[PDB]
């Protein structure tokens, strides 16, 4: 019944829906790639931008899991660039006061970022480091509630100098694999592989580009990885299913450390849906130029939804149109 | 169809799209290799293909028809059209590459310089405009892309449109080249190729970051070989200029080096004291491209390729067929 969904709301992209035993309805619109008539298919892949910050906090919990590291450890304890009295939990629910590279909360330009600091030679983590690292802090590590890029970036680097690993080959290892997921990874726009979506941006003298030169080249631990519907089905069973992590730490995860506002609260990495004290839903989603993202797991019926679409809007409200089906 | 350019470019294993026609014959043309390797979409004849410094031939073509048309001297000076000063260089020395002009080139060269933001001609002065001259203009051939650059703004300041816009409208379309154009990377459309780059540890990347992000007036404009093979066509039956015009752009202005000259935006093998061939060609990152026409047997050949080399081994391959 999704296609109907995404036609109704001419969503480019894929949608997923998992009644918890029952095999997924999956549903694919509109083209990967536009020139090429290459349509969108259920084994497309999509950028994801900040829906991956969960695999960021999963890759984290795991190193604490593991005894490598714990919530409480200072970011001076792993990390050369000073931010004071910063933790990982601090990073982990954005409340570390750290400056951000892209303050989303004033900024919405992100292409704008790019304009002078060529987004192809942000390859390693470690590139973004100069891009915030001089800037003071915004508040005092703990102080309050505020969505932060560059937070889960310093996770990043922190996955990298505790494992030993790059960022990217720590999740593709024992996110990724680790759940069954062989159709996602940290992919560069100068080696795309099939089955891979183009992001296309709308503009407003009417004409579309694709964006390439708008995304730092490759994903990291803030946002840009890439998945197909199903993989990312995949992920919240293997998370839901102490696949990942224990139960202990899973939890520890899903977690309402923070309280955002009104029934939202943020986790580890992820957002959390609570309304007459009851947890609705756990969600993560993303944003970036032509690129959308909405995923769940609903608690309740053991659902999954997944709606990845590159196009710059749209998920949402196909994500809506779906929890109503639930 | 299988032809005998098949087995040439399988020879040599080259990705891309060549032509040959001899005189007044139906031309052969043969495909190879993919457009799109990820996606294992096949090069056809209808592809297009980046042809690197391909194109100065057709700024030189511009350029001309602008003095044809009375609007500009070979001798003008560029100080009566560019602000940007490059004191006593004429059109005449720019075409030629005896201008003693500084250049840009010479990516090291995008490390430092988005190459997405180079969208417009302009925004290659800052890369030399500010250097020092290399030697008085006319003094000595050396080849110059800034030099291009510089003839790509006169055609803009003189004609009041974009460069590309000018080169589409009159040269393309007076030719009869109705699939070929200045394409931008993040806007490519159908039937257009990749360029890519083949590493050592044997892996590959596509030139998307390796190149201006939009094809100019020293090069990077896309072209099919039956566009091409058109292109010459209509220069040497002077639909693109008069007889006159098209002699000056087709004379050996500069000896280069033996048998090599070079006249207006064109290259020209001499030897024996007679013209055995008008040619062009192209090297970029995951491009590659040779094309002439032959006097002798009103003979065109083209050669187009999304790889780094091998064009020249293909041109010379069908060539030794004349």
């Given at each position: 019944?999704?296609?109907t969904?995404?036609?109704?709301?001419?969503?480019?992209?894929?949608?997923?829906?998992?009644?918890?035993?029952?095999?997924?309805?999956?549903?694919?619109?509109?083209?990967?790639?536009?020139?090429?008539?290459?349509?969108?298919?259920?084994?497309?892949?999509?950028?994801?931008?900040?829906?991956?910050?969960?695999?960021?906090?999963?890759?984290?919990?795991?190193?604490?899991?593991?005894?490598?590291?714990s919530f409480?450890?200072?970011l001076?304890?792993?990390?050369?660039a000073?931010?004071?009295?910063?933790?990982?939990?601090?990073?982990?629910?954005?409340?570390?006061?750290?400056?951000?590279?892209?303050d989303?909360?004033?900024?919405?330009?992100?292409?704008?970022?790019?304009?002078?600091?060529?987004?192809?030679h942000?390859?390693?983590?470690?590139?973004?480091?100069?891009l915030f690292?001089?800037?003071?802090?915004?508040?005092?590590?703990?102080h309050?509630?505020?969505?932060?890029?560059?937070?889960?970036?310093?996770?990043?680097?922190v996955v990298?100098?505790?494992?030993?690993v790059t960022?990217?080959?720590?999740?593709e290892?024992?996110?990724f694999?680790?759940?069954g997921?062989h159709?996602?990874?940290?992919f560069?726009?100068?080696?795309?592989?099939?089955?891979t979506?183009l992001?296309?941006?709308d503009?407003?003298?009417?004409?579309?580009?694709?964006?390439?030169?708008?995304?730092?080249?490759?994903?990291?631990s803030?946002?840009?990885?890439?998945?197909?519907?199903e993989?990312?089905?995949?992920?919240?069973?293997?998370?839901?299913?102490h696949?990942?992590?224990?139960?202990?730490?899973?939890?520890?995860?899903?977690?309402?450390h923070?309280?955002?506002?009104?029934?939202?609260?943020?986790?580890?990495?992820?957002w959390?849906?609570?309304?007459?004290?009851?947890?609705?839903?756990?969600?993560?989603?993303?944003?970036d130029?032509?690129?959308?993202?909405?995923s769940?797991?609903?608690?309740?019926?053991?659902?999954?939804?997944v709606?990845?679409?590159?196009?710059?809007?749209?998920?949402?409200?196909?994500?809506?149109?779906?929890?109503?089906?639930?």
């Open positions: 019944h999704l296609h969904i995404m036609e109704d709301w001419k969503l480019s992209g894929t949608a997923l829906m998992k009644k918890g035993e029952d095999i997924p309805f999956i549903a694919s619109l509109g083209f990967a790639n536009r020139a090429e008539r290459i349509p969108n298919e259920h084994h497309t892949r999509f950028g994801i931008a900040s829906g991956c910050k969960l695999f960021t906090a999963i890759a984290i919990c795991q190193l604490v899991e593991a005894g490598k590291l409480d450890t200072p001076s304890d792993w990390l050369d000073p931010f004071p009295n910063v933790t990982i939990h601090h990073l982990l629910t954005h409340t570390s006061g750290v400056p951000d590279y892209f989303e909360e004033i900024t919405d330009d992100f292409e704008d970022l790019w304009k002078d600091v060529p987004m192809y942000l390859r390693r983590l470690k590139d973004f480091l100069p690292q001089h800037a003071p802090m915004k508040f005092p590590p703990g309050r509630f505020h969505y932060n890029n560059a937070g889960f970036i310093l996770l990043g680097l990298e100098s505790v494992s030993g960022f990217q080959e720590y999740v290892a024992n996110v694999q680790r759940a997921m159709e996602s990874g940290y560069a726009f100068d080696t795309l592989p099939a089955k979506a992001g296309y941006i503009l407003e003298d009417g004409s579309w580009k694709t964006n390439l030169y708008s995304l730092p080249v490759i994903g990291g803030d946002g840009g990885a890439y998945v197909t519907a993989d990312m089905m995949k992920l919240w069973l293997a998370l839901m299913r696949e990942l992590l224990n139960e202990t730490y899973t939890q520890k995860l899903l977690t309402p923070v309280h955002c506002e009104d029934d939202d609260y943020y986790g580890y990495g992820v959390i849906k609570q309304q007459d004290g009851a947890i609705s839903k756990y969600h993560v989603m993303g944003y130029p032509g690129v959308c993202f909405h769940a797991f609903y608690p309740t019926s053991n659902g999954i939804v709606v990845c679409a590159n196009q710059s809007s749209g998920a949402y409200d196909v994500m809506a149109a779906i929890e109503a089906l639930f």
